[PDB]
Coordinates of C-alpha atoms in Angstrom, one line a residue:
Chain A
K189 CA 0.9 28.3 25.9
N190 CA 4.5 27.3 25.3
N191 CA 3.2 23.8 25.5
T192 CA 4.0 22.5 22.0
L193 CA 7.5 21.8 20.7
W194 CA 7.5 20.6 17.1
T195 CA 8.6 20.4 13.5
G196 CA 5.4 22.0 12.4
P197 CA 2.5 20.1 10.7
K198 CA 3.9 19.6 7.2
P199 CA 7.7 20.2 7.2
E200 CA 10.0 20.3 4.2
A201 CA 12.7 17.6 4.0
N202 CA 14.5 18.0 7.3
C203 CA 15.9 14.6 8.2
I204 CA 18.6 12.3 6.9
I205 CA 18.1 8.5 6.9
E206 CA 20.7 7.5 4.4
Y207 CA 24.2 7.2 5.9
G208 CA 26.7 9.5 4.3
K209 CA 24.1 11.6 2.5
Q210 CA 24.7 15.4 2.9
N211 CA 21.1 16.8 2.6
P212 CA 17.7 15.8 4.0
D213 CA 16.1 12.8 2.2
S214 CA 13.1 12.5 4.5
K215 CA 10.4 14.5 6.3
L216 CA 10.1 13.9 10.0
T217 CA 7.0 15.3 11.7
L218 CA 7.6 15.3 15.4
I219 CA 5.3 16.9 17.9
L220 CA 5.9 17.1 21.7
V221 CA 3.2 18.4 23.9
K222 CA 3.8 19.2 27.5
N223 CA 0.9 18.0 29.7
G224 CA 1.4 17.9 33.5
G225 CA 4.5 15.8 34.3
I226 CA 4.6 14.0 30.9
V227 CA 5.1 14.7 27.2
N228 CA 2.6 13.3 24.7
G229 CA 4.5 12.7 21.5
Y230 CA 3.4 12.2 17.9
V231 CA 5.8 11.1 15.1
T232 CA 5.6 10.2 11.4
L233 CA 8.3 9.9 8.8
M234 CA 7.8 10.5 5.1
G235 CA 10.4 9.6 2.4
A236 CA 11.8 12.3 0.1
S237 CA 14.4 10.5 -1.9
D238 CA 14.6 7.5 -4.3
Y239 CA 16.7 5.7 -1.7
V240 CA 14.2 6.1 1.2
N241 CA 11.2 5.5 -1.1
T242 CA 12.6 2.1 -2.3
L243 CA 13.5 0.7 1.1
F244 CA 10.2 -1.2 1.2
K245 CA 11.3 -3.2 -1.8
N246 CA 12.9 -5.4 0.7
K247 CA 11.2 -7.6 3.3
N248 CA 13.5 -6.7 6.2
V249 CA 14.2 -3.1 6.9
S250 CA 15.2 -0.8 9.7
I251 CA 14.9 2.9 9.8
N252 CA 16.8 4.9 12.4
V253 CA 16.3 8.5 13.5
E254 CA 18.6 9.8 16.2
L255 CA 17.9 13.1 18.0
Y256 CA 20.5 14.7 20.3
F257 CA 19.8 17.7 22.4
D258 CA 21.8 20.2 24.4
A259 CA 21.3 21.3 28.0
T260 CA 18.5 23.6 27.0
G261 CA 16.7 21.0 24.9
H262 CA 17.7 22.4 21.4
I263 CA 18.7 19.9 18.7
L264 CA 22.4 19.3 17.9
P265 CA 21.9 19.3 14.1
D266 CA 25.3 18.0 13.0
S267 CA 25.0 14.7 14.9
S268 CA 21.2 14.4 14.8
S269 CA 19.2 12.9 12.0
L270 CA 17.0 16.0 12.2
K271 CA 18.9 19.0 10.7
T272 CA 16.6 21.8 11.8
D273 CA 15.8 22.5 15.5
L274 CA 12.3 22.0 16.8
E275 CA 10.4 25.2 17.5
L276 CA 7.8 26.2 20.1
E277 CA 4.3 27.0 19.0
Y278 CA 3.9 29.9 21.4
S279 CA 13.9 30.2 25.1
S280 CA 14.6 26.9 26.8
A281 CA 12.9 23.7 25.8
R282 CA 14.4 21.7 28.7
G283 CA 11.0 20.9 30.0
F284 CA 10.2 18.8 26.9
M285 CA 13.2 16.6 27.3
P286 CA 13.1 13.1 28.7
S287 CA 13.7 12.9 32.4
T288 CA 17.3 11.9 33.4
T289 CA 15.7 10.5 36.6
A290 CA 13.1 8.3 34.9
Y291 CA 15.4 7.5 31.9
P292 CA 18.9 7.9 33.3
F293 CA 22.1 7.9 31.5
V294 CA 24.1 4.9 32.6
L295 CA 27.6 3.7 32.4
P296 CA 28.3 3.2 28.6
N297 CA 28.6 -0.6 28.5
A298 CA 27.7 -1.7 32.1
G299 CA 24.8 -4.2 32.3
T300 CA 21.5 -3.5 30.7
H301 CA 18.8 -0.8 31.2
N302 CA 15.6 -1.6 29.4
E303 CA 14.1 1.0 31.6
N304 CA 15.1 3.5 28.9
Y305 CA 12.9 2.1 26.1
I306 CA 9.4 2.5 24.8
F307 CA 8.1 -0.1 22.4
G308 CA 5.0 0.0 20.2
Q309 CA 3.7 -0.4 16.7
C310 CA 2.6 1.7 13.7
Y311 CA 2.0 0.7 10.1
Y312 CA 3.0 1.2 6.4
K313 CA 0.1 1.1 3.9
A314 CA 1.6 -0.2 0.6
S315 CA 0.6 1.0 -2.9
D316 CA -1.7 -2.1 -3.3
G317 CA -3.5 -1.3 0.0
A318 CA -1.9 -4.0 2.1
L319 CA -1.1 -2.9 5.6
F320 CA 2.2 -3.9 7.2
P321 CA 3.0 -3.6 10.9
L322 CA 6.1 -1.6 11.9
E323 CA 7.7 -2.4 15.2
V324 CA 8.7 0.8 16.9
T325 CA 11.5 1.3 19.5
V326 CA 12.1 4.6 21.2
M327 CA 15.2 5.0 23.3
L328 CA 15.4 7.8 25.8
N329 CA 18.7 9.1 27.1
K330 CA 20.6 6.0 28.4
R331 CA 23.7 6.6 26.2
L332 CA 25.6 9.6 24.8
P333 CA 27.1 9.9 21.2
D334 CA 29.6 12.5 22.5
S335 CA 30.3 14.8 25.4
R336 CA 28.3 17.7 23.9
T337 CA 25.0 16.0 24.4
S338 CA 22.6 16.3 27.3
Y339 CA 19.5 14.4 26.1
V340 CA 18.8 11.6 23.7
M341 CA 15.7 10.4 21.8
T342 CA 16.0 7.8 19.1
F343 CA 13.4 6.1 16.9
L344 CA 13.7 2.8 15.2
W345 CA 11.0 1.5 12.8
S346 CA 11.5 -2.1 11.9
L347 CA 9.7 -4.2 9.2
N348 CA 10.2 -7.9 9.1
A349 CA 7.7 -9.5 6.7
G350 CA 7.4 -12.7 4.6
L351 CA 6.7 -10.1 1.9
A352 CA 8.1 -6.7 0.7
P353 CA 5.3 -4.3 0.7
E354 CA 6.6 -3.0 -2.8
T355 CA 8.2 -4.0 -6.1
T356 CA 8.5 -0.3 -7.1
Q357 CA 9.3 3.1 -5.7
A358 CA 6.5 4.4 -3.5
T359 CA 6.2 7.3 -1.1
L360 CA 7.3 5.9 2.3
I361 CA 5.0 6.9 5.2
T362 CA 5.1 5.6 8.7
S363 CA 1.6 5.9 10.1
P364 CA 1.4 8.2 13.1
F365 CA 3.0 6.7 16.2
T366 CA 2.1 8.2 19.6
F367 CA 3.8 7.8 22.9
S368 CA 4.3 9.4 26.3
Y369 CA 7.3 9.9 28.6
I370 CA 8.2 11.5 31.9
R371 CA 9.6 14.9 31.3
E372 CA 12.5 16.8 32.8
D373 CA 11.9 19.9 35.0
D374 CA 11.1 23.1 33.2
Chain B
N275 CA -1.6 20.1 40.0
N276 CA -3.0 18.2 37.0
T277 CA -0.7 15.2 37.7
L278 CA -1.2 12.5 40.3
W279 CA 1.6 10.0 40.6
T280 CA 4.0 7.7 42.3
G281 CA 6.9 9.9 41.2
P282 CA 9.2 9.3 38.2
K283 CA 11.5 6.6 39.8
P284 CA 9.8 5.2 42.9
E285 CA 11.3 2.8 45.4
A286 CA 9.7 -0.6 45.9
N287 CA 6.1 0.2 46.6
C288 CA 3.9 -2.6 45.3
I289 CA 3.2 -6.3 46.2
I290 CA 2.8 -8.8 43.4
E291 CA 3.4 -12.1 45.3
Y292 CA 0.3 -13.3 47.2
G293 CA 0.9 -13.6 50.9
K294 CA 4.0 -11.4 50.7
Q295 CA 4.4 -8.8 53.4
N296 CA 6.4 -6.0 52.0
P297 CA 6.8 -4.5 48.5
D298 CA 8.4 -6.9 45.9
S299 CA 8.2 -4.5 42.9
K300 CA 8.3 -0.8 41.8
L301 CA 5.1 0.6 40.3
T302 CA 5.4 3.8 38.3
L303 CA 1.9 5.2 37.7
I304 CA 1.2 8.7 36.4
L305 CA -2.3 10.1 35.9
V306 CA -2.7 13.4 34.1
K307 CA -5.9 15.4 33.7
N308 CA -6.5 16.4 30.1
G309 CA -9.9 18.1 29.8
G310 CA -12.6 15.4 30.5
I311 CA -10.1 12.5 30.4
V312 CA -7.1 11.3 32.3
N313 CA -4.1 10.2 30.3
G314 CA -2.3 7.4 32.2
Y315 CA 1.2 6.0 32.0
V316 CA 2.1 2.7 33.9
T317 CA 5.2 0.5 34.2
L318 CA 6.1 -2.2 36.7
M319 CA 9.7 -3.2 37.7
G320 CA 10.6 -6.3 39.6
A321 CA 12.3 -5.9 43.0
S322 CA 12.4 -9.5 44.3
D323 CA 13.7 -12.9 43.2
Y324 CA 10.1 -14.2 42.8
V325 CA 9.0 -11.4 40.5
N326 CA 12.3 -11.5 38.6
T327 CA 11.9 -15.2 37.9
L328 CA 8.3 -15.3 36.7
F329 CA 9.5 -15.0 33.1
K330 CA 11.2 -18.4 33.4
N331 CA 7.7 -19.6 32.6
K332 CA 6.0 -19.2 29.2
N333 CA 2.6 -18.4 30.7
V334 CA 2.5 -15.6 33.3
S335 CA -0.1 -13.3 34.8
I336 CA 0.7 -10.2 36.9
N337 CA -2.0 -8.4 38.8
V338 CA -2.0 -5.0 40.3
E339 CA -5.1 -3.9 42.1
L340 CA -5.7 -0.3 43.3
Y341 CA -8.6 0.8 45.5
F342 CA -9.3 4.4 46.2
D343 CA -11.5 6.2 48.8
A344 CA -14.1 8.8 48.1
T345 CA -11.4 11.5 47.6
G346 CA -9.2 9.4 45.3
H347 CA -6.7 8.3 47.9
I348 CA -5.2 4.8 47.9
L349 CA -6.5 2.3 50.5
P350 CA -3.1 0.6 51.1
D351 CA -4.3 -2.4 53.2
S352 CA -6.3 -3.8 50.3
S353 CA -4.4 -2.3 47.3
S354 CA -1.3 -3.8 45.7
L355 CA 0.2 -0.3 46.1
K356 CA 1.2 0.5 49.6
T357 CA 2.0 4.2 49.3
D358 CA -0.5 6.7 48.3
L359 CA -0.2 8.8 45.1
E360 CA 0.8 12.4 45.3
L361 CA 0.1 15.5 43.3
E362 CA 3.0 17.2 41.6
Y363 CA 1.6 20.6 42.7
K364 CA 1.6 20.4 46.5
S365 CA -6.9 18.0 49.0
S366 CA -9.0 15.9 46.6
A367 CA -7.7 13.6 43.9
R368 CA -11.4 12.8 43.1
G369 CA -11.0 14.4 39.7
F370 CA -8.4 11.8 38.7
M371 CA -10.6 8.9 39.4
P372 CA -12.5 6.8 36.7
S373 CA -16.0 8.0 36.1
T374 CA -18.7 5.9 37.8
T375 CA -21.0 7.0 35.1
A376 CA -18.8 5.9 32.2
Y377 CA -17.4 2.8 34.2
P378 CA -20.2 1.8 36.6
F379 CA -20.2 -0.5 39.6
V380 CA -22.4 -3.4 38.9
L381 CA -23.9 -6.5 40.6
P382 CA -21.2 -9.2 41.2
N383 CA -22.6 -11.4 38.4
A384 CA -20.4 -13.4 36.0
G385 CA -20.2 -11.7 32.6
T386 CA -18.0 -9.8 30.3
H387 CA -18.9 -6.2 31.4
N388 CA -16.9 -4.9 28.5
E389 CA -17.7 -1.3 29.2
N390 CA -15.4 -1.4 32.3
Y391 CA -12.4 -2.7 30.4
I392 CA -9.5 -1.2 28.4
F393 CA -7.4 -3.6 26.5
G394 CA -4.0 -2.9 25.0
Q395 CA -0.4 -4.2 24.7
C396 CA 3.1 -3.5 26.0
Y397 CA 6.3 -5.5 25.9
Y398 CA 9.0 -7.3 27.8
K399 CA 12.6 -7.3 26.3
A400 CA 14.3 -10.4 27.4
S401 CA 18.0 -10.9 28.2
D402 CA 18.7 -12.3 24.8
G403 CA 17.2 -9.1 23.3
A404 CA 13.9 -10.8 22.2
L405 CA 10.8 -8.8 22.5
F406 CA 7.7 -10.4 24.0
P407 CA 4.3 -8.8 23.8
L408 CA 2.4 -8.5 27.0
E409 CA -1.4 -8.3 26.8
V410 CA -2.7 -5.6 29.2
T411 CA -6.1 -5.5 30.7
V412 CA -7.2 -2.4 32.7
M413 CA -10.5 -2.7 34.7
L414 CA -12.2 0.4 36.0
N415 CA -14.6 0.3 38.9
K416 CA -17.1 -2.5 38.1
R417 CA -16.6 -4.5 41.3
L418 CA -16.5 -3.0 44.8
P419 CA -14.3 -5.2 47.0
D420 CA -15.7 -3.8 50.3
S421 CA -17.6 -0.9 51.9
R422 CA -14.5 1.3 52.2
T423 CA -13.9 1.7 48.5
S424 CA -15.2 4.3 46.0
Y425 CA -13.1 3.7 42.9
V426 CA -11.2 0.7 41.5
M427 CA -8.4 0.5 38.9
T428 CA -6.8 -2.9 38.3
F429 CA -4.0 -3.9 35.8
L430 CA -3.2 -7.3 34.4
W431 CA -0.2 -8.0 32.3
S432 CA -0.5 -11.4 30.5
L433 CA 2.3 -13.3 28.7
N434 CA 1.3 -16.4 26.8
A435 CA 4.3 -17.6 24.7
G436 CA 5.4 -20.8 23.0
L437 CA 8.8 -20.4 24.7
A438 CA 9.6 -18.8 28.1
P439 CA 11.5 -15.5 27.7
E440 CA 14.2 -16.4 30.3
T441 CA 16.1 -19.4 31.7
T442 CA 17.6 -17.3 34.5
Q443 CA 16.8 -14.4 36.8
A444 CA 16.4 -11.0 35.2
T445 CA 14.9 -7.7 36.2
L446 CA 11.3 -7.8 35.2
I447 CA 10.3 -4.6 33.4
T448 CA 7.0 -3.9 31.6
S449 CA 7.5 -1.4 28.9
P450 CA 5.4 1.7 29.4
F451 CA 1.7 1.3 28.8
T452 CA -0.5 4.3 28.1
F453 CA -4.2 4.6 28.2
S454 CA -7.0 7.2 28.6
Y455 CA -10.2 7.1 30.5
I456 CA -13.2 9.3 31.3
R457 CA -12.6 11.0 34.6
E458 CA -15.0 11.9 37.5
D459 CA -15.9 15.5 38.3
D460 CA -13.4 17.4 40.5
Chain C
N115 CA -13.6 24.2 26.7
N116 CA -10.7 22.0 25.8
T117 CA -13.1 19.0 25.4
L118 CA -15.5 18.3 22.5
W119 CA -17.6 15.2 23.0
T120 CA -20.8 13.1 23.0
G121 CA -20.7 13.0 26.8
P122 CA -19.6 10.0 28.9
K123 CA -22.6 7.7 28.5
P124 CA -24.7 8.8 25.6
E125 CA -28.1 7.6 24.5
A126 CA -28.3 5.9 21.1
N127 CA -26.9 8.6 18.7
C128 CA -25.3 6.7 15.9
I129 CA -26.5 4.7 12.9
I130 CA -24.5 1.6 11.8
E131 CA -27.0 -0.2 9.6
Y132 CA -27.1 1.6 6.3
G133 CA -30.6 2.8 5.3
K134 CA -31.8 2.6 8.9
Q135 CA -33.9 5.6 10.0
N136 CA -32.9 5.9 13.7
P137 CA -29.8 5.3 16.0
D138 CA -29.0 1.7 16.5
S139 CA -25.8 2.3 18.4
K140 CA -24.1 4.5 21.0
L141 CA -21.0 6.3 19.9
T142 CA -18.8 7.7 22.6
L143 CA -16.4 10.2 21.0
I144 CA -14.2 12.5 23.1
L145 CA -11.8 15.0 21.5
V146 CA -9.4 16.9 23.8
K147 CA -7.4 19.9 22.6
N148 CA -3.9 19.6 23.9
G149 CA -1.4 22.1 22.5
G150 CA -1.2 21.7 18.7
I151 CA -2.9 18.3 18.8
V152 CA -6.2 16.6 19.7
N153 CA -6.2 13.5 21.8
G154 CA -9.2 11.3 20.9
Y155 CA -11.0 8.5 22.7
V156 CA -13.6 6.5 20.8
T157 CA -15.8 3.4 21.7
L158 CA -19.0 2.1 20.0
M159 CA -21.8 0.2 21.8
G160 CA -24.5 -1.7 19.8
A161 CA -28.2 -0.9 20.6
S162 CA -30.1 -3.0 18.1
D163 CA -30.4 -6.7 17.2
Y164 CA -28.6 -6.1 13.9
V165 CA -25.6 -4.5 15.4
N166 CA -25.5 -6.9 18.3
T167 CA -25.5 -9.9 15.9
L168 CA -22.7 -8.7 13.7
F169 CA -20.1 -10.7 15.6
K170 CA -21.8 -14.0 14.7
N171 CA -19.7 -13.8 11.6
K172 CA -15.9 -14.2 11.3
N173 CA -15.5 -11.2 9.0
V174 CA -17.0 -7.9 10.2
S175 CA -16.5 -4.4 9.2
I176 CA -18.0 -1.5 11.1
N177 CA -18.0 2.0 9.6
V178 CA -18.8 5.4 11.1
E179 CA -18.4 8.6 9.0
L180 CA -18.4 12.1 10.6
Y181 CA -18.8 15.2 8.4
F182 CA -18.3 18.6 10.0
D183 CA -19.0 22.1 8.7
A184 CA -16.6 25.1 8.8
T185 CA -17.2 25.8 12.5
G186 CA -16.6 22.2 13.5
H187 CA -20.3 21.1 13.8
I188 CA -21.5 17.7 12.7
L189 CA -23.7 17.5 9.6
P190 CA -26.2 15.0 10.8
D191 CA -27.9 14.3 7.4
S192 CA -24.8 12.7 6.0
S193 CA -23.0 11.7 9.3
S194 CA -23.5 8.4 11.1
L195 CA -23.6 10.4 14.3
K196 CA -27.0 12.1 14.4
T197 CA -26.4 14.4 17.3
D198 CA -23.8 17.2 17.4
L199 CA -20.9 17.0 19.8
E200 CA -20.8 19.5 22.7
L201 CA -18.2 21.6 24.5
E202 CA -17.7 21.1 28.2
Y203 CA -17.6 24.9 28.1
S204 CA -17.0 27.2 17.1
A205 CA -15.2 24.0 17.4
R206 CA -13.0 24.5 14.5
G207 CA -10.0 24.2 16.7
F208 CA -10.9 20.6 17.4
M209 CA -10.9 19.7 13.7
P210 CA -8.2 17.7 11.8
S211 CA -5.7 20.1 10.1
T212 CA -6.2 20.5 6.3
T213 CA -2.5 21.3 6.3
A214 CA -1.5 18.0 7.8
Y215 CA -4.3 16.1 6.3
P216 CA -5.5 17.9 3.1
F217 CA -8.4 17.1 0.9
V218 CA -7.3 15.9 -2.5
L219 CA -8.6 14.8 -5.8
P220 CA -7.4 11.2 -6.7
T221 CA -1.7 7.6 -3.8
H222 CA -2.2 9.7 -0.8
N223 CA -1.9 7.9 2.6
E224 CA -0.8 10.6 5.0
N225 CA -4.5 11.1 5.9
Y226 CA -4.7 7.8 7.9
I227 CA -4.2 6.6 11.4
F228 CA -4.1 2.9 12.0
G229 CA -4.3 1.0 15.2
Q230 CA -6.0 -1.7 17.1
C231 CA -8.6 -2.1 19.8
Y232 CA -10.5 -5.2 21.0
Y233 CA -13.7 -7.1 21.5
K234 CA -14.2 -9.5 24.4
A235 CA -16.6 -12.2 23.3
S236 CA -19.2 -13.8 25.8
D237 CA -16.9 -16.8 26.3
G238 CA -14.1 -14.5 27.4
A239 CA -12.0 -14.7 24.2
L240 CA -10.4 -11.5 23.2
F241 CA -10.6 -10.5 19.5
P242 CA -8.4 -7.7 18.1
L243 CA -10.2 -5.2 15.9
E244 CA -8.1 -3.4 13.3
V245 CA -8.9 0.3 13.3
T246 CA -8.5 2.8 10.4
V247 CA -9.2 6.5 11.0
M248 CA -9.3 8.7 7.9
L249 CA -9.0 12.5 8.2
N250 CA -10.3 14.7 5.5
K251 CA -8.9 13.5 2.1
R252 CA -12.2 12.9 0.3
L253 CA -14.7 15.7 0.0
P254 CA -18.2 14.4 -0.6
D255 CA -20.0 17.7 -0.9
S256 CA -19.8 21.5 -0.6
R257 CA -21.4 21.6 2.8
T258 CA -18.4 19.7 4.3
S259 CA -15.3 21.3 5.7
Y260 CA -13.7 18.3 7.6
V261 CA -14.1 14.5 7.6
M262 CA -13.3 11.9 10.3
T263 CA -14.1 8.3 9.5
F264 CA -13.7 5.2 11.7
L265 CA -13.5 1.6 10.4
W266 CA -13.3 -1.3 12.9
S267 CA -12.5 -4.6 11.1
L268 CA -12.5 -8.1 12.4
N269 CA -11.1 -11.0 10.3
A270 CA -11.0 -14.0 12.4
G271 CA -10.5 -17.8 12.0
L272 CA -13.5 -18.0 14.3
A273 CA -16.6 -15.9 15.3
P274 CA -16.6 -14.3 18.7
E275 CA -20.3 -15.2 19.1
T276 CA -22.9 -17.8 18.3
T277 CA -25.7 -15.5 19.6
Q278 CA -26.7 -11.9 20.2
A279 CA -24.5 -10.1 22.6
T280 CA -23.9 -6.4 23.3
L281 CA -21.3 -5.2 20.7
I282 CA -18.7 -3.0 22.6
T283 CA -15.5 -1.9 21.0
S284 CA -12.8 -1.5 23.7
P285 CA -11.6 2.2 23.9
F286 CA -9.4 3.3 21.0
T287 CA -7.2 6.4 21.6
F288 CA -5.5 8.4 18.9
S289 CA -4.0 11.8 18.3
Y290 CA -4.0 14.2 15.3
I291 CA -2.8 17.6 14.4
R292 CA -5.5 20.1 14.8
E293 CA -6.7 23.1 12.8
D294 CA -6.2 26.6 14.1
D295 CA -8.8 27.9 16.6

């Protein structure tokens, strides 16, 4: 009913984690479901390169995904980590965007606006079965990368362990992280 | 229509400080009907020097109490929240209330009464950028405060840290907490 | 209609103690169809001395396995839940996607949701319970078309309880990609 905006359930490599790299090195599953005045979100990232799939050979690691949308809620693929636009399940996608009233854009470097953040946790299950917490930070709007952009949504997964989940290459998977935010008018 | 809320960016509407006379904080609360459950979203922002200095202590508790009449309208005299919720689609808000079958009222006896509680976690980001977990307790119904009340929803954010997050005044903001509960019939 | 569930306050309908003949617990499971996903809500309540004494130990693992047929109905012989879910109205559309979460023959960890809920002990102490949800992945038989398993784990320095007390897992919410209607 128009109510789902997503990457599909099992997307091909569509996302770039590694700075400078020219083609997707990861698979971002992102699902945004419109429900009343909020969006319910579901996001998981799967590695698809040796670089991404060896990140957890280190104890401290940060993975950033930046999504920038235009005025009609379509991805700007050049600047975004995600290189393919989201699609509706069943035209404008403005109504899935984060509210600029609840999560306003602010003056670039003036004060602090922690009103624009969602924090949470998901996990990485290592090849030996050990489960490591990943701290999740979602930033909504707040700040523009350029003057072409109308909406912002960034994800940061952060691991800080006494130990490195891995000593070898292993398929990176962030366990599903769910979240909700106040959506813009349709 | 299927959303009952305070709006996305409410003016000070909630009293934290005991004895205080007018709102000292901004409560954002959004309740969305989703089949037989409600999906909830809640965050609290400080709007007074008292609230905005609580995090100078390492152990803090913040209580918000909401009491609703038989048609799911706030009772402002007894509730922490002094302005009623409104529907996005401008009748009864009964269908948004926590089920008295799932979350019963019981005799005022000491006890854990676990069935009436939802536990979870949200966060406070301090001025220095440090992230503090806040333990969240949601109580549904369980204890009637008087003969005027038909539904109860209370929130507690607890901080118990080894170090206080702040040494100075800073805008208190609870990162968004989401939860779901079984709702009453419309 | 858009809700598939046990109901809000079910009678004993679930078996936790392996080999036991009848329900020893009350599983509340609520699955709401929301666009391309299901939003789930699950809590377990003990209803036997065995279940209600588990938390006298520091290490506790509670497992529930749900096996569904092709039209999304519980297989009670093999499932921990002995009564089928009901619509508030085929429930295939409520089932976990075999595209997102495929069955496989034996590393494959995309089939897991991890999280936390809690147990409040009689003395008021709050204990976190580590939650693992597994979707499909392992096919036990030919009668089964979808799998949904829950594991609640406590590993504590100390035991929530010295005596019998009603086991209640605080509500755990989760979301997964659903199969086509």
